[PDB]
């Protein structure tokens, strides 16, 4: 069958934060990972029960802050590239990986057609009513694009898509 997801926590992470960071209960992430009853540890690896494994999944989101574009990739080759908010002077390479964990039903409002979640706190892939700041403005690091674009990606990238955000060089 298809495997459940793995996560590797970064220095400073905490149980509750990570659980509902994964849109789940700490107890469920505990059930699968009794190491975490007590807590989480930098570089430690944890399973996300009820969520499939990103290695069964072939999808690879390469959004380099340096590249200022988020590249979709299947089977070692890109699917398509979407523009995102990087900034005009924002350094510090976040050496970590996130996963496309969720997609939300048509909200009905300016939430941007779809709400897709990343795996670390204040990061998400979503939509907009204003795409003109996308890739061309300092929108405080918002990973949003056109409605249909974020639904394209949405339906292709599954509940465990690998996504990295790095300034590169
Ligand atoms: C980016 O497009 C916005 C930015 C988004 C957010 S956080 C929104 C909710 N995310 C999910 N919990 C902003 C914020 O300050 O909270 N603003 C930018 C253009 O203002």
Report the SS3 class of residue 153.
helix
Rounded CA-CA distance 19/62 in Å is 24
Length of the chain: 169
- Widest CA span of the chain, in angstroms? 46
What H or E segment, with its residue span, contains residue 149? helix 147-156
Q: Measure the N-to-C terminal CA separation of the chain; round to a whole number of Å.
A: 40
Token duo for residue 80: 């398509």
Q: Which CATH class is domain 51-169?
A: mainly beta
Rounded CA-CA distance 29/121 in Å is 16
Rg (CA), the chain: 16
Rounded CA-CA distance 11/42 in Å is 4
What is the domain partition of the chain in residue ranges? Answer: 1-50, 51-169
Q: What is the 75 CA–ligand 1 centroid distance (Å)? A: 32
Q: What is the 142 CA–ligand 1 centroid distance (Å)? A: 6
Fold type of domain 1-50? Membrane-bound Lytic Murein Transglycosylase D; Chain A (3.10.350)
Pocket lining for ligand 1, CB < 6 angstroms: 124, 139-140, 142, 144
Name which residue sits closest to atom 12 of ligand 1, judged by CA: 122
Tell me, yes or no, if the two domains 1-50 and 51-169 fold the same way.
no
Burial class (CB in 10 A: 0-12, 13-18, 19+), 141: middle
Residue 162's alpha-carbon distances to 77, 108, 149, 157, in angstroms, are 14, 28, 18, 9
> What's the half-sphere exposure (Cβ side, CA atoms, 13 Å) at 138?
5
């Amino acid at each position: 069958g298809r495997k459940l997801l793995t996560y590797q926590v970064k220095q400073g992470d905490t149980l509750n934060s990570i659980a509902a960071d994964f849109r789940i209960s700490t107890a469920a992430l505990l059930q699968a990972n009794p190491s975490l009853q007590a807590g989480l540890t930098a570089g430690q690896s944890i399973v996300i029960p009820g969520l499939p494994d990103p290695y069964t999944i072939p999808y690879h989101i390469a959004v380099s802050i340096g590249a200022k574009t988020l590249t979709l990739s299947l089977n070692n080759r890109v699917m398509k590239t979407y523009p995102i908010a990087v900034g005009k002077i924002l350094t510090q390479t976040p050496t970590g990986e996130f996963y496309i964990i969720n997609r939300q039903r048509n909200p009905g409002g300016p939430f941007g057609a779809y709400w897709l979640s990343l795996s670390k706190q204040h990061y998400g892939i979503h939509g907009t009513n204003n795409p003109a700041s996308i890739g061309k403005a300092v929108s405080k690091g918002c990973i949003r694009m056109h409605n249909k674009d974020v639904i394209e990606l949405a339906s292709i990238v599954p509940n465990g898509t690998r996504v990295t955000i790095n300034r590169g060089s």
